[PDB]
Amino acid sequence: LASPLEQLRHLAEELRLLLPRVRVGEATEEFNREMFWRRLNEAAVTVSREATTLTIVFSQLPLPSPQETQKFCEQVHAAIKAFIAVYYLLPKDQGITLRKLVRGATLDIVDGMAQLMEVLSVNSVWVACQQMPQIPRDNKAAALLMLTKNVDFVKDAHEEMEQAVEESDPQDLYWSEDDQELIIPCLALVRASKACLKKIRMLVAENGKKDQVAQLDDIVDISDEISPSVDDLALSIYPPMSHLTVRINSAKLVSVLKKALEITKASHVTPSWIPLLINAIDHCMNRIKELTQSELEL
16 A cells, blocks of 8 residues: 555546546436435535545544555545536437536546646645536536636626737837727627627526527527627627638638527527627628728739
8 A cells, every 4th residue: 555645646637637527428318307406416515525634634633554545545535436427417409508517617626636636646626616506507507607717708808808908009019000990899899799608598598498408509509609709709809800711700700600600599598689780790790891901812
């Protein structure tokens, strides 16, 4: 048996080896919605007990004997194994979005517990274990969550670019008057994007129905694209900003928003406001095409 601090080092290592495995995982007509969430919670509590136990113990001297450490390490692994096992009990059946969140929480826990084991060898885990009650328990709430995560991301991008522009002086690495002028539409387009996600969230909130696992997953899937579009768009705005690239990215975003809106209109979630959001969006893009025509002329 190795050193106690050495033994933990290996526990940590052995722990991270799971992350890849948990990312991709095997998984039912008889599925206990409530019995599931009960077991997972317990799983979590147990995990954090072990974290606490190890923490208090390896905080003081002398350290435990090598065999004592061996037991501790096992308890930790057992607690982790048991938790993952519960995760693996959740059927894709219940929602891809739902499963992603449980999966991510599961990984967070595993990774946290690994971080701590390293640290002890020389509060991610506890926080991670705290999360259990918070995480959604049906694909509707999961979708809602995912949607607000998007709204927020877009909102920040907006703010960043806006501050960015403001601070711009009242050669390269600069913004031209032309650059400045073309930024205006791009920014509204981003704002319209947020407007879109918020509209979608709202409709899902008001009309979404837990049963519609597939459609919820659908609306979420396309919704998620809005953010990287925006991200790509923003990144090309900053200098040196190629107008050609801005035009392309803008068009990508538009196509996305529209695809998002279209999928929402067909879902069980539909009502209107969508047509005039599309008016705003078209006007932005039209304005962007116009500010940028000389690039695509010959």
